[PDB]
Structures are given as structure tokens and as C-alpha cells.
Amino acid sequence: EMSLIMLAAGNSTRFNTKVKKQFLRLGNDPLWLYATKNLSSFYPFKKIVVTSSNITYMKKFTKNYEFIEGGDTRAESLKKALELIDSEFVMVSDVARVLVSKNLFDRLIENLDKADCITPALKVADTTLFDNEALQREKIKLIQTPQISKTKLLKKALDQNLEFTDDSTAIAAMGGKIWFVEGEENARKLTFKEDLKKLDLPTPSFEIFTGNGFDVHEFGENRPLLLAGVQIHPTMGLKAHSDGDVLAHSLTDAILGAAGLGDIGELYPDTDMKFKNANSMELLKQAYDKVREIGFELINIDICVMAQSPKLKDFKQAMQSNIAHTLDLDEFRINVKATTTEKLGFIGRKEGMAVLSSVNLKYFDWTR
Amino acid sequence: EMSLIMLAAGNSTRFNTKVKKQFLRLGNDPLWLYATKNLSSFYPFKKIVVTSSNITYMKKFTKNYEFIEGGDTRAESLKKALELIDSEFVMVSDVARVLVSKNLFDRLIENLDKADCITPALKVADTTLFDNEALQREKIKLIQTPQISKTKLLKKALDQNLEFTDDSTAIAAMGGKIWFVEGEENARKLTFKEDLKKLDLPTPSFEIFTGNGFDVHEFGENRPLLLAGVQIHPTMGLKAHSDGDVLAHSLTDAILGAAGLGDIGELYPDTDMKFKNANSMELLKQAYDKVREIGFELINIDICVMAQSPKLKDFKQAMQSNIAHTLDLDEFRINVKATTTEKLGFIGRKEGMAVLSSVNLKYFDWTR
Amino acid sequence: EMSLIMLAAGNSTRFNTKVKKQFLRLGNDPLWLYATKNLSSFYPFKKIVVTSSNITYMKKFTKNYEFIEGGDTRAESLKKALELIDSEFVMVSDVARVLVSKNLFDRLIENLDKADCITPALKVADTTLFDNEALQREKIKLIQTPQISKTKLLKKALDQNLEFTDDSTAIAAMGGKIWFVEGEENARKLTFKEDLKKLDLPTPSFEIFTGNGFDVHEFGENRPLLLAGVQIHPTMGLKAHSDGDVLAHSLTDAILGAAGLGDIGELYPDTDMKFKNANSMELLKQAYDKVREIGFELINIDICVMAQSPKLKDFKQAMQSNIAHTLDLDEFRINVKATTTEKLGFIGRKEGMAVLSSVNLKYFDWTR
Amino acid sequence: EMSLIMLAAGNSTRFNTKVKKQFLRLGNDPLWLYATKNLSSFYPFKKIVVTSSNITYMKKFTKNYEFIEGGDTRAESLKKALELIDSEFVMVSDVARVLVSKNLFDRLIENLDKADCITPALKVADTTLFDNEALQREKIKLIQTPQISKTKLLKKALDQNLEFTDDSTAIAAMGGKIWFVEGEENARKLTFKEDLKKLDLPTPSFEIFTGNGFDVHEFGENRPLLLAGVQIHPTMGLKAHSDGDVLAHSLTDAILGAAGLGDIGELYPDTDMKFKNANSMELLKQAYDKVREIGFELINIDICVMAQSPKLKDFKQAMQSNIAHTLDLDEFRINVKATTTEKLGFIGRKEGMAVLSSVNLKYFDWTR
Ligand SMILES: Nc1ccn([C@@H]2O[C@H](COP(=O)(O)O)[C@@H](O)[C@H]2O)c(=O)n1
Ligand SMILES: Nc1ccn([C@@H]2O[C@H](COP(=O)(O)O)[C@@H](O)[C@H]2O)c(=O)n1
Ligand SMILES: Nc1ccn([C@@H]2O[C@H](COP(=O)(O)O)[C@@H](O)[C@H]2O)c(=O)n1
Ligand SMILES: Nc1ccn([C@@H]2O[C@H](COP(=O)(O)O)[C@@H](O)[C@H]2O)c(=O)n1
Ligand SMILES: Nc1ccn([C@@H]2O[C@H](COP(=O)(O)O)[C@@H](O)[C@H]2O)c(=O)n1
Ligand SMILES: Nc1ccn([C@@H]2O[C@H](COP(=O)(O)O)[C@@H](O)[C@H]2O)c(=O)n1
Ligand SMILES: Nc1ccn([C@@H]2O[C@H](COP(=O)(O)O)[C@@H](O)[C@H]2O)c(=O)n1
Ligand SMILES: Nc1ccn([C@@H]2O[C@H](COP(=O)(O)O)[C@@H](O)[C@H]2O)c(=O)n1
Ligand SMILES: CC(C)=CCC/C(C)=C/COP(=O)(O)OP(=O)(O)O
Ligand SMILES: [Zn+2]
Ligand SMILES: [Zn+2]
Ligand SMILES: [Zn+2]
Ligand SMILES: [Zn+2]
């Protein structure tokens, strides 16, 4: 009997960009789940645990695994996770190590009894420099994952010290015995931008996601009217909680809703007002930065500004242009339309204005 | 002179799932039309007739063929269809037999005069058991399609008896003579889930379909407020015709509209009220079940609830969660936003509430 | 030192259809930019100039190149463009010549000094007929592109005469010396429909574009009510500026907005009224004709007609059918829903009606 | 009723190298037969005639076609060939035009009655120069093949004049009417080295051919002993008919025998002695030049020199080296062994010496 831990928590700008690597799309599945799915196919684990910096989101993708909140470091994470494990044995692995082959798994498990922790390793044939200083290459081992370990010893191995980079050194530094099985190129750890092209990773699925956004604001506030952060009119201002950009909030909602990241108020509520100031376009940027973190990319934006006045004709290239700049996309993907309601309803009576945004999101093309 | 009948009517849960197999997408075309297109390329038929359990829908896909309503059985269907045929000869084929090669067609037609009905057949080299009891394998024939038959004889062959599974046995059981041309693996009949991977079928096109949905309901009804079938508030009910779920009807429309299946009222009208009760979420399920039958699958849902009150914040994970369950999709594909209209208009005055749904549908990935 | 001119202006129905060929999608990039990108990768040009019949649109795709308005002919265009060039040398090329290989470029530039203009050429081994009359095939040269020319001489070569088809004959007809480097099949000029399948062109990207459309019209005009150009009711007309088709204008906006071509008023404004008459469905056709010109194609239309009356039930197949005909798409891609607002708001009070359109556009599949 | 002529005669160093292009291997078949096979699949021709500069060789490849000896020119060839044709119609084609598609054939034959000769043609979109001088490109036609012609008129069309490059101009120059069907890129004429990579030609089959060679010469001739044209010994000469190189003749036979080109005496007989002089290595070169002409290339040579004396040890790198140079191959492909017969038999008694050559030939890799 043996359980599995997938360590998928933390986050750092090594690989990273604006997009977390556990959230890269390989097929329909995000990396973290792709990896967990792959390992989980190999063996009936008594329990599967996944460490996370994003439990609530992660959870919306499956019901199969127990999720435990990550720690400050890999070991910290792993300790926390082990406390949920009662099987005699445990197999721990990095999600970043996506394409671990069944072959290698069989090699690990066929040596289950020889020592206290079992590990893939590879030799090094190149001149190795530790700090611009030569090292005897034959004595080097590159250590991979998964690693199978006796639960009881691993829990104890991490009672005090939490600086260990892998299970093997942890078990080792407590007197335990280590068994080195030959590793493989498929077990590489996705750490740098450059690594992506070095792995036979499935390119992301072609699904496109839609989002809508609707927002209303009351007229009659003596300040400038800002839409997509372009100044439309010096006094015909909107009675808002921020700088009053109905366009920008409408669009924000649409971008969020497409990513299943709620709506604008779940992020930037009217109750707390460090948002009193609020440059809405910046709030929009930040909204998109969240969508980008979970592996999404805007295809296009279509906006429809419902307002009886003022005539937004002259300002429409300026609005499209500013969105493009803020959200960092080519100008052609942005389109701002406008319409009166022919004097009908609150919009037509001039009580306020509304904006209707429409968006499509694709999964980030990580093939550069 | 020779006409063509494509038998594409009926329906049964042999292959089936929630999706009719004539509606599977192979390229841009649904199976039934893909198959009819393929056969129709091979020969200038005087008339092409397609039997259907879905004329009105089927018709929206071409203007080339005459459609006749199907019968209770294959023969029943075929009789009905022959009554539209005046050419001396007729070629009948199952749509389910998609990839019939030009080669085999040439073999059929090059033997047009030798007998009364001409048919593909294959021998069997395996031990064959009729009812767990061995049968002399050499005496067996697996009969395929198309089959060319002399119209006059086929019409007569089906005057009384309608139990016949293919044209050959029908012509045969009336004294007529049958000619067996060698069949092929491409002429296989798509009957079971498992068959799909046994055929070199073109994978479905990557087109995504959009849908919008808008619905309004009046406030002031002393009962609970249900949205996506989650109870929001015990008394602030909506004045509806059913349980009053504006969300669920708005979403229903969007799912229907994306599939070109009309709107909610074309299915579930306010006139007839066996819908007086009406659990709207179940009506939604049923709506989706129609969309699924014609080869579609939801990518994502984005909903925007326009309501001045109550504050739906606390209930948004519960709404998303319930939709996911009802429509049987992963939770991450559902997003429910909400907005007041800042006291403006009927929504803002609290007269009623509106919901705006946005959806994308992809063609069903039948590669499992 | 050497600058680059990409000639991408003009337009004619040689290749053409309803779609301009510089706007065909090869990867994410339109042809003109794909081609300019390819050449621009080969050498650090001091200045890159692109000639255009569409500057404003073209500009929304990059910030890298200087765009100058095209002339009536290729030479006219080229003269205009040279006036922006101060480098000693210039390389001119047709955008239509998309896949020009690095190899051939190296051949051009490695012969930079031998003469006044350097050009790819190919021999002809077939019987050649000039006007059904045989010509000595060995004496023929098919002239390609790019061509490198000494700026000063090319400017002068086009001072008077502007009938020249390529740089070489222009330089030649002024006494200058021409150097013929062997051309290639990749440097072919995309001129006819048939040429597409003769080039290894990257198929278009799979991105889908969304568009929304909203339009309102006031009731109480004694004439017929036209929606999608189907007559709904003989007297319950809308107070419009044209024939009053709210559906058709709503849809027009959506189709435009998806293509980033603004909104309906940017095309067909209420100020000028040669649109007084206005058959809106024809205006819609024309709108789509613009979207088609820039490489887009409708996947589907979903429309939601907000109107308290009249009951549009009986007319919904007729509306879908008429749109299909006007926009020239299969009937199944069109869906018209309708909803009252349960007597609430201006719509529900019967003051006017609104329509909400939703659309998805894909890039034109030029593989036929 | 219609017959086919494949013109495969003549030869020139346009494409050519050391290898005739009708003899290039595409699959197992040489080009000429590959092409004839392709056209012959398309239609039951009453008679198939192939013109040849190599009847006797050509004949060893099939029994299906009538072969007639070629003329000095293409027309000369074609006249000669027509005299074997009695069908009303004839289709003539260049073998060099290998991959003519069924599609295009159907286009030719579906216009069989409209005029006197029917021909594929393509337009030209490039600037065309006739003798460095511009020509109105729209008036140009590139003429392809096949061409269908009325036999009677074609025979007459070539009664006097034989300078015509294709059937169309010949029929035309006699008043007959010409019909131009659109041609294709697959109908290109393989004329230049460079053309090969422009056609989707099947790469040659992987068959290897073996050859053996045995030759004996009597000792006791007061001159130098030459083997592979290296001087072995100043006086121990062989009593030959030429310079006496037993090695070189043995190897010649082996190279010929592998190519089914007979033996050395069929080329260079002892009766005629302009071979009295005879530098055998040059005769060997020439032998290989024949093998090269019919599409073959040496993989390796293994030679075994049976001689009781002299000891050839010191001269074996020099022999291998000289063969390599003569036959123009890398040195590693040549190996010369030697053996006495331990004083037994004529060899061992020193009456003469024998040489046994072994060779493998592959088909020329025309992919450069
Ligand atoms: N605090 C941390 C740090 C890393 N990890 C995971 O451990 C694996 C290996 O860690 P590093 O990539 O940081 O070396 C990664 O897949 C990462 O997601 C974790 O679960 N908790
Ligand atoms: N009925 C409503 C209206 C608004 N809200 C929330 O309040 C936020 C701010 O709403 P307004 O912009 O309409 O003031 C929204 O983003 C939404 O999260 C809600 O939860 N229920
Ligand atoms: N009542 C029926 C039953 C079957 N059929 C068609 O006949 C073909 C063969 O029938 P079975 O698959 O039911 O044997 C199928 O393509 C099916 O669509 C029909 O047109 N009408
Ligand atoms: N103007 C209208 C309004 C509604 N309807 C139909 O009536 C149905 C119910 O509409 P309400 O939900 O607006 O009462 C809709 O689904 C639509 O089919 C219509 O056909 N014409
Ligand atoms: N007036 C014109 C005509 C053609 N051109 C460009 O010159 C190139 C070659 O011209 P033609 O295709 O018209 O021969 C094309 O890529 C076309 O876009 C231009 O830039 N201005
Ligand atoms: N506030 C507004 C309202 C309308 N417009 C423009 O006026 C045009 C006609 O608007 P109506 O249909 O609302 O009269 C729209 O297409 C839009 O270009 C605008 O520029 N600013
Ligand atoms: N004397 C000749 C010259 C050419 N030909 C054939 O005619 C075809 C076209 O001729 P050219 O390639 O010489 O133009 C070639 O396939 C060539 O083999 C012939 O059969 N007799
Ligand atoms: N004429 C000869 C005969 C033999 N030899 C060499 O002497 C070796 C032994 O030859 P026997 O086996 O014929 O005695 C051969 O392998 C060959 O290298 C030679 O170099 N010249
Ligand atoms: C698709 C969408 C969101 C359409 C909005 C159009 C609409 C129903 C306006 C209501 O009018 P109103 O509330 O301003 O009328 P009044 O305030 O006079 O009652
Ligand atoms: Zn707001
Ligand atoms: Zn409702
Ligand atoms: Zn309008
Ligand atoms: Zn000899």
C-alpha cells in the first residue's frame, strides 16, 4: 500500500512571465492536473494529495484528489501534505515534471524493498563547474522524481529541517539508505521558458471562452467623463465610486467572467475605498493579469456603449487605442461601438449610461 | 438511369449516448450529410432522397435533396422513400456506412445487369457462434451497402412484409436473383461506440458557436427566490409562470440559441401549464439534452444577473455549483456575475430582475 | 546600407472574390504582414515602407513600418514610396510573393555590385505562345522579386513613365544594367485562386472573434414593421431613419464590431440620407461584404428580439431564412429568439423595441 | 477510339549529367515506364506506342507497348510513331512530364469534340522578357501535355515541316482549330536538374544489384604488369590484347553484369583492335559511364586477385586509390585482396593470373 503526493504549490518568476506554469494548458487539462492524471493512471494509490497555492480554483477542476494548502518552501509543503497520509509508502513528485513515463515508474516500484527512499538519477558527461571551478564530473548525480519513500521516515526526516530540495537528501541526512534508479529525459523539471521546447508537451486545446460584461452608472457629477480612460467631456461626469469609467468596469467584468474569476466587485468592492481614487484602467490591467496567471489570453474585445449623450464618435479610435495599450494587445482586437436608446428609458432620458462588453479568451499559446 | 436513397431516419441507444450518430460532426458536415455528399459525388443520380426523423432541422443544411419522413423500421422507411422514385434503378444505402469508397461503387455498377439486386458482401474466417453454438463459417456472408436494385421489384418486394434488414433478402424472398460483389472494411456500419475508432473518420471541425440569452421577471410574489435553483431569499419571489428562475431561463435561451434550436418558449410555452409546477433547472437540463442530441457540447457559461437586490454575493459559488451539476460540466466553465443598475430604470426601481447569459458551444469530440 | 519597400496596395478581381488577398490569413498574420515580416527577418533594413490601400486598418497590426498611400498602378505606388527612401540601395518586393526564401535573398545580395538592378528570373521549357503564335522558348525570362536596385536610378527611372511592371525593365529602359540571378518556385506571385494550392502557405489560425450588437427604435409609425426584412405587421411600424429594421441594424453592428470595423453609424450615418429610403437588409449585406474583404467569415448568428409585442413566433423561421439568404450562409447558423420584458420598462410599456445580436467570426478558410 | 504515344527518345545535356532522365528511378520503374504506366492507367488505349533511343534495353522492362525508334527531333520522332496509329484520335505526351493527374486527363477528354487538337495551358502573371525586352504578359501561354489530336490531321500536319515543338502549333499552322484547357503544375516538364525538387516525384526503390566478374590472362610477355593501371613489375607482363590489365577487365565485367549490360567483349571485342593500344582503366571508366546513363551508382567494389606471383601487398593501396580516381568514388568503397593457389593448378604453376570481382549497384539517388 502506497499513496501519492503531487507538489504543485508555490510560485516564482524562474520560468514565469505573467503566467503560472501549473496553469499552462496541455490538452484540455492544466499542467498540474495533466501531471497528476498521468501519475495517477500508473497505480491505484490509496490516497492522492495535491499541494496548492490555489485550492479553491484548483478544486473546480476535479473531485478526485485531496488538496492541502502549500507552505513557504517545497519541504514545508511536503510536511503539511504527509500529515494526511497513513499508507506505509508514499510517492512524491513535482508537477513541473510532467511527462514521467510508465517505464520509469515500473523501475521505481520494482526496487521498492532495497532501501528507504528510491529515486531516479542521471549521470553527467560534461565538464561541470561549481562556481566557475571544475568538479570531477563522474561524482555528480542529477536527481529526479518521482521518489518513493517510507512514509514514517519521511515524516520524521522533515520534523525539524525544512531546507531539503528532494526526498532523498532528507531521508539520507537522517541515516536512512537511498537507492538510485536510472532516470530519464521525460522526467525533466519544467523550470525555465527554454525548457518548454525541450519537452514533447501536448499543445493546448483549441477551446475559446466567452465573457459578457454589463455596468451602469448615474449621470450628474461635476468632473470629467472618462471612458476607457480617455477624457470625453470636461464636466458631464458619472456619479461613481472610483473615477467612474463605465467602459472599463464593463470590460473588466467580461474579461473576469470569461475566466470564471467572478465579477469586478469580488475583486474591487465599493465598501473598502483605497479604491476611492481608483484609476479604473489600472484595475482593468490588474484584472487581466489574473486571467493571464491562469493560462488565458484575449482574442478580441467588442464593446457597446449605451449612452444618449455625448456623441462618442470622435473618441472611438482613442478608446480602442488606450485599451490596446493598457491590456497590451494589438489595436485590431479592440472595437468600441456606441448607441443611444432614442430618448427611451433611463438611458434615453439621460439619467445614466450603460456599457455592454463581449470578449473571447483562448488558452495561452506557450509555443512562443 | 438510377436514383439514390440515403436511409438516415430512426434512432436507438445501440451506439447512442446522449448524441444521435447521424449528427456527429465529420469535418463541417454532420454524418448524415457527409455520407450523402460522399455517395452523391460518385454518380449523377436523377433524384436523391434522404429519410429523416428530423426533416425540418436536416433541411437547414442543404437544398440538394428531397427529404421524406422515416417509418417505424428501416423497411418502412425505405418503402415510403421508394414511392418518390421513378428511375428504373435505385441505390439504397445506410448513412451509418460513412466512408464507402469510389472503388466499391464501381464494382457495384460494373455488374449492374447480372441480377436483380447487387450487393457488397464479406466472408468470415473466424469461428462463428449462432447462440453459443458453432456454425460452419464458410457458409456465412456479412452483407453491406450500398445495394443497387431494380426499383419496380424493390417496391413490390416491400408491399407486404416490412421486417427485412437489407434490400438483398427482400428481393431474394420474392424469387428475384442476387449478385454478391466483394465488400470492404470502409463500408462498415457505424453501430457501436467502439466502431468509431475502427473507422478513418474525419475529426470534427473546430468551429465554436455563440449564444445569448435575455429574460425578465417581475418582482413581488410571496414565495422563495430561486436562481439557478439555489434559494436566495425566502420571500422576495418573482411573479413567474413556473418556479420563477430567471437565471435558468436566460441560460436556457442562450444554450438553445447557440444551437439554432429557437428559444425557450418554442419548447416550454406559458400557454400549456403542465409547466405550472416547473422546476426550471430540469427544463434547462432537457434543453441541453436537445443540444447534445445534435452534436454540440458546452465550452463555457457566463451569466450576468441584473438585479438591484438582493446581494447575490454569498450565493454565487452555490449557483455556479448547481449549474455544473445540472448540466453535467466541470465547475470551472460556469461563472455568475451580478450587477445593480444604480437605482435607475425598472431594475433599479426594484420592479423586476433581468439576466443576461453568454455561451460557447463546440462540436462534440467523438474521439472520446 | 539598404531599405525595403513592400508593395501591398491596389486591388483587382484577378485572384479576388469577395476577399482581398493581402488580407488572407497565414498563421495569425494577414498575408501582407506575413510577407513583410518574412523579408524583414532577412536583413536589418534602415527603413521599411509598405504601400497600402488601407493605411488606417493596416496600421492597427504593427508599429514597425512606415505606410504610404498607394497609387493607381504599381509604379505609381513605387514612385510615391521611394520618396521616403534615402539609403543608397532599395529592395522592392510584391506582398503577393509570400514565401521568398532566405537562400534566394543571399543570392541577390551576394551579387550586389555586378549591375544596377538585381533580379530573380526563371527559364521556360514549355512551348510558349504569344497570342496563339509560337515563340522561341529559350529567349524567355519569367521575372520575379525581390529586386535590389540603386535608389537614385530607380527614382529617376520612374520620373516620367509609370507603365513599367517591375524594377528591372524600368532601370533597363533608362540605359542601366541588369543582373539576372536564378529565381525559385517559392517566389511565385499569388495572383489566381488556383495559385493558393500551388504554394506551401501556412493555413489560417483557429482564432474566433466575437461581436455584440444593440439597437433601439421608438414605436408609433404608421407603416409596416420590418424585421430582418420580413413584414411582421402592416401598421405597427417603427419611427426610424430608414425602413426601421431594428433587427438588421443590431446584427450589422455585431458583424462590424467582431471585425473591428466600428459600428453602423460610422458607415451609414443618420445625417446624410440617401439612406432615407434604406433597405436595411441590403445595408447589412454591404456591411458583411466589408468584413469579408478583410478575411473574415461568419460562423453563427444569435439574435434576441426584446419586444412586448407583436408575438414574433410565427415569423421566426422566416427571419432566419431571410438573413441566411441575404448574408449567403446555411440556414442552420441563424437563430432568432424573442422576449417581452413582462410589461416593465420602456420595452414593456410599448414605447419601442430593442434587439441584441451575438456573432462569431472565423478567418476565411482559403483552402476552398 | 484513341491511341497513346509516349515520346521518350532523344537525349541532351539540359537536365543531364552522366544520367539519362528517362532512366531515373521513381519507385521500381524507370521514369519513362513510370510515366507511360501512369497515362496508360487512365483510359483503355487501342494501341500504346513509346518512342525510344534505347529500344532493346527499354524492351526488357515490359511486353505491353510497341516501341518505335526515335528521330532526330521530337516531331521527327512523332511522325515515325503516328505511322503505327490507326485510331481516329491520338494522345501524345512527353515522358519528361511524369505526374500528369487523372483530373487533367478528364478535362482533356471532356472537350474532345470542340476542336482539332486539345491542350493544357497555363497563364503567366510575371513580367515576361523576350530577349531582355518586356512582353505583354497577358498574351502568353505556357503549353503542356498530353495533347489530344485527330490522327489524320496530325499525320498531315507533319508531312513537310518537322520543327514544331508541340502538337498544337503543328495542327494550328495547318489551319486546324485549337482548344486550350487549363493545365496544372503536375504536368510540368522535367528539363533541368532544378526541376526535380519542384515535383512530388517518388524517390527511387532501395533495391541493390549484384555483379560478378572473372578474367584470366596468360603470363610471359616482356613488358610491364599493369593492374588497376598501377605498374606492379617492369617485365612480368601479361599476354593480352590490350595493355593486359586483368584486374580492370574483371571489374569491368562485374560492373556491366550488375547492370545487365552484358560483358566486356560485347563492348570491346578482341577482333577489332583500335583496342590494340587500349588503356583498360579508360575502357573501365567508359563501361561505368554506360551504367551511370541507365540510373545506377556503385556502392562498393571487392576484388580478389588470384596470382602465385608477384606479391601484390605493397601495391594494394595504390590499386584501390587508382580505381577510386578512375571511377570517381570515395576510396573506402574499393578493396583489393590477393591470393596464391599454393602452387596448384595453372595459377599456382605460374602460367597466368585470374581476378574475381564482386560489386553492388544501387539506383542513383537523384535527390542530390
Ligand atoms: N513552496 C513550494 C514550492 C514548490 N512546490 C512544488 O515543488 C516542485 C519543485 O519545486 P521547485 O520547482 O521550486 O524546485 C514544483 O512542482 C513546485 O510546484 C510546492 O509544492 N511548494
Ligand atoms: N444584486 C447584486 C448586485 C451587485 N452585486 C455585487 O456588487 C458589485 C458592485 O455592484 P454595482 O456595480 O451594481 O454597484 C458587483 O460586482 C457584484 O459583485 C451582487 O452581489 N448582487
Ligand atoms: N426506421 C429506420 C431505421 C433505420 N434507418 C436507417 O437505416 C440504416 C440501417 O439501419 P440500422 O442501423 O437500424 O440497421 C441506418 O443508417 C438508419 O439511420 C432508417 O432510415 N429508418
Ligand atoms: N415579442 C415576442 C415576445 C415573446 N415571444 C415568445 O414568447 C416566449 C415567452 O416570452 P416571455 O418570457 O417574454 O413571456 C418567448 O420564448 C418567445 O418565444 C415572441 O414570440 N414574441
Ligand atoms: N497600384 C498598385 C498595384 C499593385 N501593387 C502591388 O504590387 C504587387 C504586384 O502588382 P500586380 O499583382 O498588380 O502585378 C502586388 O503585391 C500589389 O499589391 C501596389 O502596391 N499598388
Ligand atoms: N452616444 C453615442 C450614441 C451614438 N453614436 C453614434 O451614432 C450612431 C447612430 O446612433 P443611434 O442608432 O443610437 O441613433 C451610432 O452608430 C454611433 O456611431 C455615438 O457616437 N455616441
Ligand atoms: N528526338 C526526340 C526529342 C525528344 N523526344 C521526347 O519528347 C519530349 C519533349 O522533348 P524536349 O524535352 O526535347 O522538348 C521528351 O520527353 C523527349 O524524350 C523524343 O521522343 N525524340
Ligand atoms: N600474389 C599475391 C598473393 C598473396 N598475397 C598476400 O599473401 C597472403 C597469403 O596468401 P596465400 O594464402 O595465398 O599464401 C594474402 O592474404 C595476400 O595478402 C599477395 O600480396 N600477393
Ligand atoms: C440586453 C439589455 C441589457 C437590454 C437593456 C434594455 C432595457 C430592457 C431597458 C429597460 O428600460 P428602462 O428600465 O430604462 O425603462 P424605465 O426606467 O422607464 O422603466
Ligand atoms: Zn461601475
Ligand atoms: Zn422567464
Ligand atoms: Zn437602428
Ligand atoms: Zn582480359
Curated annotation (Swiss-Prot), chains A, B, C, D:
It catalyses: 2-C-methyl-D-erythritol 4-phosphate + CTP + H(+) = 4-CDP-2-C-methyl-D-erythritol + diphosphate; 4-CDP-2-C-methyl-D-erythritol 2-phosphate = 2-C-methyl-D-erythritol 2,4-cyclic diphosphate + CMP. Residues 209-368 are annotated as: 2-C-methyl-D-erythritol 2,4-cyclodiphosphate synthase. It holds the Pfam family YgbB. GO terms for biological process: isopentenyl diphosphate biosynthetic process, methylerythritol 4-phosphate pathway; terpenoid biosynthetic process. Keywords: Isoprene biosynthesis, Lyase, Metal-binding, Multifunctional enzyme, Nucleotidyltransferase, Transferase. 4-CDP-2-C-methyl-D-erythritol 2-phosphate binds at residues 215-217, 241-242, 263-265, 268-272, 307-313, 339-342, 346, 349. Pathway: Isoprenoid biosynthesis; isopentenyl diphosphate biosynthesis via DXP pathway; isopentenyl diphosphate from 1-deoxy-D-xylulose 5-phosphate: step 2/6; Isoprenoid biosynthesis; isopentenyl diphosphate biosynthesis via DXP pathway; isopentenyl diphosphate from 1-deoxy-D-xylulose 5-phosphate: step 4/6. The record marks 14, 21, 241, 340 as: Transition state stabilizer. PROSITE patterns: ISPD, ISPF. It comes from the Bacteria. In the N-terminal section; belongs to the IspD/TarI cytidylyltransferase family. IspD subfamily. In the C-terminal section; belongs to the IspF family. Bifunctional enzyme that catalyzes the formation of 4-diphosphocytidyl-2-C-methyl-D-erythritol from CTP and 2-C-methyl-D-erythritol 4-phosphate (MEP) (IspD), and catalyzes the conversion of 4-diphosphocytidyl-2-C-methyl-D-erythritol 2-phosphate (CDP-ME2P) to 2-C-methyl-D-erythritol 2,4-cyclodiphosphate (ME-CPP) with a corresponding release of cytidine 5-monophosphate (CMP) (IspF). This is Bifunctional enzyme IspD/IspF. It comes from Campylobacter jejuni subsp. jejuni serotype O:2 (strain ATCC 700819 / NCTC 11168). The lineage of its organism: Bacteria, Pseudomonadati, Campylobacterota, Epsilonproteobacteria, Campylobacterales. The gene is ispDF.
